Design a protein around this motif. Structure first.
Motif, PDB file in Angstrom:
ATOM      1  N   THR D 136       8.647  -4.322  -3.626  1.00 37.70           N
ATOM      2  CA  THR D 136       7.573  -5.165  -3.122  1.00 37.70           C
ATOM      3  C   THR D 136       6.250  -4.639  -3.663  1.00 37.70           C
ATOM      4  N   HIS D 137       6.313  -3.629  -4.558  1.00 36.82           N
ATOM      5  CA  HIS D 137       5.064  -3.163  -5.149  1.00 36.82           C
ATOM      6  C   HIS D 137       5.158  -3.172  -6.677  1.00 36.82           C
ATOM      7  N   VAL D 138       5.251  -4.363  -7.278  1.00 39.62           N
ATOM      8  CA  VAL D 138       5.487  -4.479  -8.718  1.00 39.62           C
ATOM      9  C   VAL D 138       4.217  -4.939  -9.425  1.00 39.62           C
ATOM     10  N   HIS D 139       3.785  -4.211 -10.461  1.00 31.62           N
ATOM     11  CA  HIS D 139       2.740  -4.750 -11.338  1.00 31.62           C
ATOM     12  C   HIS D 139       3.437  -5.400 -12.536  1.00 31.62           C
ATOM     13  N   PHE D 140       3.177  -6.688 -12.771  1.00 27.28           N
ATOM     14  CA  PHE D 140       3.765  -7.363 -13.925  1.00 27.28           C
ATOM     15  C   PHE D 140       2.869  -7.094 -15.121  1.00 27.28           C
ATOM     16  N   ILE D 221      -4.531  -7.209  -0.930  1.00 22.25           N
ATOM     17  CA  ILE D 221      -5.890  -6.688  -0.818  1.00 22.25           C
ATOM     18  C   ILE D 221      -5.918  -5.342  -1.558  1.00 22.25           C
ATOM     19  N   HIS D 222      -6.823  -5.199  -2.539  1.00 22.27           N
ATOM     20  CA  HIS D 222      -6.890  -3.947  -3.257  1.00 22.27           C
ATOM     21  C   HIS D 222      -8.351  -3.513  -3.308  1.00 22.27           C
ATOM     22  N   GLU D 223      -8.597  -2.214  -3.088  1.00 21.24           N
ATOM     23  CA  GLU D 223      -9.961  -1.703  -3.147  1.00 21.24           C
ATOM     24  C   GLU D 223     -10.668  -2.030  -4.465  1.00 21.24           C
ATOM     25  N   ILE D 248      -1.817  -4.243   1.638  1.00 22.24           N
ATOM     26  CA  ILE D 248      -3.155  -3.676   1.486  1.00 22.24           C
ATOM     27  C   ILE D 248      -3.086  -2.299   0.789  1.00 22.24           C
ATOM     28  N   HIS D 249      -4.020  -2.100  -0.152  1.00 21.57           N
ATOM     29  CA  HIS D 249      -4.440  -0.814  -0.672  1.00 21.57           C
ATOM     30  C   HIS D 249      -5.897  -0.671  -0.239  1.00 21.57           C
ATOM     31  N   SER D 250      -6.139   0.193   0.759  1.00 18.07           N
ATOM     32  CA  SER D 250      -7.431   0.165   1.447  1.00 18.07           C
ATOM     33  C   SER D 250      -8.527   0.907   0.642  1.00 18.07           C
ATOM     34  N   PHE D 274       0.626  -0.504   1.666  1.00 16.83           N
ATOM     35  CA  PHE D 274       1.234   0.021   0.440  1.00 16.83           C
ATOM     36  C   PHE D 274       0.948   1.532   0.361  1.00 16.83           C
ATOM     37  N   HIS D 275       1.791   2.265  -0.417  1.00 18.12           N
ATOM     38  CA  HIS D 275       1.665   3.712  -0.647  1.00 18.12           C
ATOM     39  C   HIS D 275       0.883   4.368   0.492  1.00 18.12           C
ATOM     40  N   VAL D 276       1.496   4.358   1.684  1.00 18.07           N
ATOM     41  CA  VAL D 276       0.802   4.676   2.927  1.00 18.07           C
ATOM     42  C   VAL D 276       0.393   6.154   2.942  1.00 18.07           C
ATOM     43  N   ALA D 279      -1.791   8.947  -1.975  1.00 17.47           N
ATOM     44  CA  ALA D 279      -2.011   9.366  -3.363  1.00 17.47           C
ATOM     45  C   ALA D 279      -2.165   8.110  -4.229  1.00 17.47           C
ATOM     46  N   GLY D 280      -1.384   7.057  -3.893  1.00 16.15           N
ATOM     47  CA  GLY D 280      -1.427   5.810  -4.653  1.00 16.15           C
ATOM     48  C   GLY D 280      -2.668   4.975  -4.309  1.00 16.15           C
ATOM     49  N   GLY D 281      -3.394   5.396  -3.254  1.00 20.21           N
ATOM     50  CA  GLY D 281      -4.648   4.750  -2.890  1.00 20.21           C
ATOM     51  C   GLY D 281      -4.793   4.595  -1.368  1.00 20.21           C
ATOM     52  N   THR D 356       8.117   0.772  -5.929  1.00 19.69           N
ATOM     53  CA  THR D 356       7.842   1.531  -7.146  1.00 19.69           C
ATOM     54  C   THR D 356       6.348   1.825  -7.364  1.00 19.69           C
ATOM     55  N   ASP D 357       5.521   0.745  -7.405  1.00 17.40           N
ATOM     56  CA  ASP D 357       4.185   0.720  -8.010  1.00 17.40           C
ATOM     57  C   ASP D 357       4.309   0.685  -9.537  1.00 17.40           C
ATOM     58  N   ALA D 358       5.340  -0.034 -10.022  1.00 20.38           N
ATOM     59  CA  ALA D 358       5.768  -0.050 -11.432  1.00 20.38           C
ATOM     60  C   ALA D 358       4.596  -0.208 -12.414  1.00 20.38           C
TER      61      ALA D 358
END
Ligand SMILES: [Au+]
Ligand SMILES: [Au+]
Ligand SMILES: [Au+]
Ligand SMILES: [Au+]
Ligand SMILES: [Au+]
Ligand SMILES: [Au+]
Ligand SMILES: [Au+]
Ligand SMILES: [Au+]
Ligand SMILES: [Au+]
Ligand SMILES: [Au+]
Ligand code: NI
Ligand code: NI
Ligand code: NI
Ligand code: NI
Ligand SMILES: [O]
Ligand SMILES: [O]
Lengths: 100, 564, 122, 564, 100, 100
Positions: D136-140, D221-223, D248-250, D274-276, D279-281, D356-358
């Motif tokens: 559920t965390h895929v960057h295309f 939502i991304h910072e 959300i990435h806060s 996301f990435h709670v 480190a991922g944000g 992932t955060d692919a």
């Protein structure tokens, strides 16, 4: 590295040539694709070394001789062609009848 | 002005009486006749003949007898003969075999083979041209198998499978309406012709027949699904009604019957007997006796082809990706006597077809390769056939080329479309350099457009520099893959509108006329006989005569050519 | 401590197959000159005609052997086998076309068997 | 007749009470129950059970309770249990989990799991079968990422991106109606399930909502786009109206607020954090406190998973593909205390999901791999969980398998279609050899057809010879790619006819029921608690108890398996 | 050269084997894919040398031993199979339990 | 072998590095892609050897120097990054300004 399509494909030729050269080192008479790989890789490495097209056209006739290859292989290979980046850009080398 | 023959052949390819070696075998084919007019040969390039006002007609629109494509100066090797001609293609079909050019100025021009503004040219001088290979024993297990097939001159895959499912890994079966529909959809993306076999198993008609109506082109009876009297009988009843072929891999175990029981269930109806020698499967040890019957269309799969020093050892451990009862079973199944005799039965015209058994127990890219290896071994051991003249191997060459072109097409009910270089058939054509003949195809043409080619560096000034390898061409790209390939389907599925229902855009081919044929319909391979297989010794006799052969240590079309 | 990736640690004991079903031992002969292997789940009365045994005793039964294995008869070999009962609906269709319904129809099964020359119908 | 257990397990896979090691970890799963009838196990091949008149029914048409596909003898590992069963598939869905075969002759046959003429067979004896992974965390960013995902058992990609544009390289966002339409079209060619997230940013409703109507399946939502009180509030108002999830990435920088401000803007509404760990944000340093709240669905991305000797160093230079103020920022962001505690929060069921955060800060093919590494590290450090019995790790195995199967599916509103091996759900299934479990999938099934397989030489007699590598199978070819994969979309875009408007031929999945869920809905991972993160020391406490862990020097599922 | 699909793929096996052999030369215990590559390449080079299937079935059991590979690798490898062109055409070699 | 997509791609890097190292052995100053291949392969082999990320970040600055490469190449290479399987799983190594 920024490999383009030709750079990726041509890695394969070097690899086939390495395989063929090991086969030759252990005393095998080389087959058709082995022979072509060895002479083709020789040409591209020659261009990388900064030789001229004219030098490689001459040298390519002396990389393998008939005693290095199986019966019929010399006659199967009428020409070998390769393009490579010389100091002055891409050029085509054609070696006619490379093995007698 | 006269041209000596050596220069003539160099420039235009060989002419009447000239011979050509097939690859590195000791087989020679001879040009039987030539459709040209000497001096008006067609050819293309700077200052050459196919130019406007000259060999190219500048007057006629494409409808006026003008070709879409001319193959110039082809040496055709086909069941119909070995001869020199131009080949003209239009609307994706072979429309003319003869002499192409411009009737303005040339003699002997075949009337519908005008080179016009609309005409593309392929130079076939110095090439051998055959029909595309028809492989009728294909397991659809891995899509990578298609290029393997194309690279060895195969243009039609008949078989079954859903990918590497165990059912598909063992049997040429796509089971049931839904799996069939899914694979017809998949087929839209495969750059080769295809027909799909359903599961030839059941004791009621409807579960079998619904596969034909869903779009299967035939059935496969396989022992792994129960090659019982009932499954055999119901499948053939379906096939007789639907006008499709049934292939059989019989009960190796003899569980429900021996060979005579299988023939009784068949009851004189048409059937294609797969890997008839029996290493690939079937009544132990006598399955190969099938090949003597008039209602049996017999094929070999390719790993037994031909008999060599490594054959038995490879087949022995091969039957361990499978495993006292085991040893006995293996010994009953892998038999030097039947594999040896299989060589000779091919040479005698008693086994009519070759096939791969791709990825189940056979090699997707070696049907054509092994056909010629077998012919070459037979010439080396048996000598030229009685029928030969002029020191040529034309008779053997026509018998063997038939095994992977016209005979499978006839057996499957698709020879009206494919299987030979004849006028009216689809333009599936393979060009071969004689030095690579039967080993690596030069160009594979599908429906009149090149689909596959050995060609070099795409970044180069010209296409010949290294590396020269097999590559998909424009016939395979975008929507053109639909127009250059045929999905073969049952008449009922076509009448019921299955293509529109599934959104198939491929050319749709009709399976027909395969209930009303037999052994006698197999070109150059039409021999019926009493085959006896001794149950104790496995010795093979044909009308009372013992057939023995021996394995060879070396084959042509092998280590001279292959990098691995 | 040595790690075999993906290894099993199976529990102790044994698995009884076909538990609670009647078992029957019979002698069977391969009168043919070619080998015959018979799978675990073929209706036993419908096997190869050239196997001689009391055909009545194969009705409604199959070999009492692990699912997916087979008994082997060399040419001329006679041996005993153990049979277990078919389950579910106790119907058989197809195979050799001797049953095509309930296995209870003993007389009809044996009549077809005898007419087609399945050996050992009394 | 009895079979000892070692031979039984060899032949049919393990049965009740038997245990299996997961790859080279020290995790053991135990068979909890078995749906078979001993002696009537299904299996396929020569002289085996699934043959006509025997384990295969010869009477019934495909509509009569007959399967399109049976997986025989599967060891299922799922949130719903660890147990032995046959799995029956029809119309691309799981229709039966139980006992397949022929009710003619077998006891205990599940009534809709008849093997018939229409049935394909996959042998799963000796395999573990799980649901496909839901990332559920895929960057295309690079289409090559799909095979990477398939090779590690992932079958659904949820995220955003237009390729390697900077917006997509930083954020799981496909912004606006046109970019969304373009990527829905692109998706037609990707052999995996997909749902696309729009930009969860704006201060008016309509610019956000129009993305949902255009066919987005959720928002991010991304910072980097401004994770302000307004963007958070408007996105959640949109999501509550549209019935889609927001990730959300806060605001890591705490520019417009601290964590408590973010929670106030959220105002008790559902959100996926996301990435709670952070480190991922996210809010430095205390973002991970999100995972204690009942309205938060918390996921980890994979590079922090699990905590190892190289973790901090790699993350330190990783945050330089980015760069006194810089050092301080890095030190505030990359924290051994929170990464350490993240291991334990996973083990306690406080973080519910992996992802992932692919290609943005995570590895497309390592969600499943790292889930098991984490479980194995936790067993090594913490011991068997209290809940375990019989010396098995079944409880931990169900808690961890949930993190990448059912829990992401629930969070995203797609668990009615995917995320578990249950009757009624789409047949996305992954077979694993236990020795490769969680490392390299054997076969990935998409909608009932194999899409991806580790399989060997396509030119060989059989499919096992080298080289064995991951390859796309027939489910990915031609039109079959449409029937075997789902594009997940908002209800509004579906009601407005977006699929027809764009010409989408993929199965269309409806996003729903993801406004009415919380932490309590996360299977095996449902723990709410007070998480305190000390602002000076970064020490993590859970209801007053300090959580420390330590890094390991070595992991299983690493150098034994990988060539690089 | 006229490479067909199998010839191109199989170059990769030789390459993996070369990589693995360098790793072994510098004293590493080999992993699963490294071990498989070495034994597979050994078989295909053996066929190129003209050995029989029977010889390669024997020799393939002695190319690597348990002390050359990491814990568990011997038990991970039940069989290695390779097809290659022998002097008598393509044949399949299967080596059962190649490493004890 | 069970190669996944990354394992197949990364074989190419090793191969380019082998090619570059032969070029260097015959006295050529190396170009941009050659230099990147050598340092990248060094990193992945280092991870295979069991070095730490920290060691490889240091060592990667000393694999090639400016006298090993053509004019401008040092300045063309701002960073080289590689991911490889360490004993503790996949990690990213970044070497800043690897050639001065
Ligand atoms: Au077999
Ligand atoms: Au087999
Ligand atoms: Au043996
Ligand atoms: Au033995
Ligand atoms: Au086989
Ligand atoms: Au950053
Ligand atoms: Au960054
Ligand atoms: Au720093
Ligand atoms: Au610094
Ligand atoms: Au990052
Ligand atoms: Ni067969
Ligand atoms: Ni077959
Ligand atoms: Ni983020
Ligand atoms: Ni991200
Ligand atoms: O077969
Ligand atoms: O992220």
């Amino acid at each position: 590295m920024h490999l383009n399509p030709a750079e990726k494909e041509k890695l394969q030729i070097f690899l086939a040539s390495e395989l063929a050269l090991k086969r030759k080192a252990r005393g095998l008479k080389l087959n058709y694709p082995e022979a072509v790989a060895i002479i083709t890789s020789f040409i591209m490495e020659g261009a990388r070394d900064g030789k001229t097209v004219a030098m490689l056209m001459e040298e390519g006739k002396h990389v393998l001789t008939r005693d290095d290859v199986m019966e019929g292989v010399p006659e199967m290979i009428d020409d070998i062609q390769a393009e490579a980046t010389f100091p002055d850009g891409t050029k085509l080398v054609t070696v006619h009848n490379p093995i007698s | 002005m006269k041209i000596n023959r050596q220069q003539y052949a160099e420039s235009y390819g060989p002419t009447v009486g000239d011979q050509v070696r097939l690859a590195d075998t000791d087989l020679w084919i001879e040009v039987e006749k030539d459709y040209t007019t000497y001096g008006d040969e067609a050819n293309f390039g700077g200052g050459k003949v196919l130019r406007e006002g000259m060999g190219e007609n500048g007057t006629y629109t494409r409808t006026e007898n003008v070709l879409d494509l001319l193959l110039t100066n082809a040496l055709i090797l086909d069941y119909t003969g070995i001869y020199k001609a131009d080949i003209g293609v239009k609307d994706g079909y072979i429309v003319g075999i003869g002499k192409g050019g411009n009737p303005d100025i040339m003699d002997g021009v075949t009337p519908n083979m005008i080179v016009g503004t609309a005409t593309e040219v392929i130079a076939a001088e110095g090439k051998i041209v055959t029909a595309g290979g028809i492989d009728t024993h294909v397991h659809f297990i891995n899509p990578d198998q298609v290029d393997v097939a194309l690279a060895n001159g195969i243009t039609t895959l008949f078989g079954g499978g859903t990918g590497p499912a165990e059912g598909s890994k063992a049997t040429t079966v796509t089971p049931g309406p839904w799996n069939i529909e899914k694979m017809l959809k998949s087929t839209e993306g495969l750059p080769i012709n295809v027909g799909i076999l359903g599961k030839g198993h059941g004791s009621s008609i409807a579960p079998i027949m619904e596969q034909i109506d869903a779009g299967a082109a035939g059935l496969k009876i396989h022992e792994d699904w129960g090659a019982t009297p009932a499954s055999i009988d119901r499948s053939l009843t379906v096939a007789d009604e639907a006008d499709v072929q049934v292939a059989i891999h019989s009960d190796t175990l003899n569980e429900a019957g021996f060979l005579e029981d299988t023939l009784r269930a068949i009851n004189g109806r048409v059937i294609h007997s797969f890997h008839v020698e029996g290493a690939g499967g079937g009544h132990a040890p006598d399955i190969m006796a099938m090949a003597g019957h008039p209602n049996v269309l017999p094929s070999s799969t390719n790993p037994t082809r031909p008999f060599t020093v490594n054959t038995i050892d490879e087949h022995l451990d091969m039957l361990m990706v499978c495993h006292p009862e085991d040893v006995a079973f293996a010994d009953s199944r892998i038999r030097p006597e039947t594999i040896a005799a299989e060589d000779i039965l091919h040479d005698l015209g008693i086994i009519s077809m070759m096939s791969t058994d791709a990825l189940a127990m056979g090699r997707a890219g070696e049907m054509v390769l092994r056909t010629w290896q077998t012919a070459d071994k037979m010439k080396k051991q048996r000598g030229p056939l009685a029928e030969e003249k002029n020191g040529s191997d034309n008779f053997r060459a026509k018998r063997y080329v038939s095994k992977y072109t016209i005979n499978p097409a006839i057996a499957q009910g698709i020879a009206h479309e494919v299987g030979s270089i004849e006028e009216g058939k689809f333009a599936d054509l393979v060009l071969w350099e004689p030095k690579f003949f039967g080993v690596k195809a030069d160009r594979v043409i599908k429906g009149g457009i090149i689909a596959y080619a050995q060609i070099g560096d795409p970044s180069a000034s010209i296409p010949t520099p290294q590396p020269v390898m097999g590559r998909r061409m424009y016939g395979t790209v975008g929507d053109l893959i639909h127009d250059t390939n045929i999905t073969f389907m049952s008449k009922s599925s076509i009448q019921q509108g299955v293509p529109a229902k599934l959104g198939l855009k491929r050319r749709i081919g009709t399976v027909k006329n395969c209930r009303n044929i037999g052994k006698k319909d197999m070109k150059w391979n039409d021999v019926t006989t009493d085959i006896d297989i001794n149950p104790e010794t496995y010795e093979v006799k044909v009308d009372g005569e013992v057939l023995t052969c021996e394995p060879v240590k070396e084959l042509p079309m092998a280590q001279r050519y292959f990098l691995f | 401590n040595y790690i075999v990736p993906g290894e099993y640690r199976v529990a102790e004991g044994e698995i009884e197959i076909n538990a609670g079903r009647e078992k029957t031992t019979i002698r069977v002969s391969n009168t043919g000159d070619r080998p015959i292997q018979v799978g675990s789940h073929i209706h036993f009365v419908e096997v190869n005609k050239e196997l001689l045994f009391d055909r009545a005793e194969g009705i409604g039964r199959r070999l009492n052997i692990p699912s997916g294995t087979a008994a082997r008869f060399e040419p001329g070999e006679e041996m005993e086998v153990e049979l277990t009962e078919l389950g579910g609906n106790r119907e058989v269709f197809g195979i050799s076309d001797l049953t095509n319904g309930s296995v209870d129809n003993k007389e009809l099964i044996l009549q077809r068997a005898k007419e087609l020359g399945y050996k050992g119908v009394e």
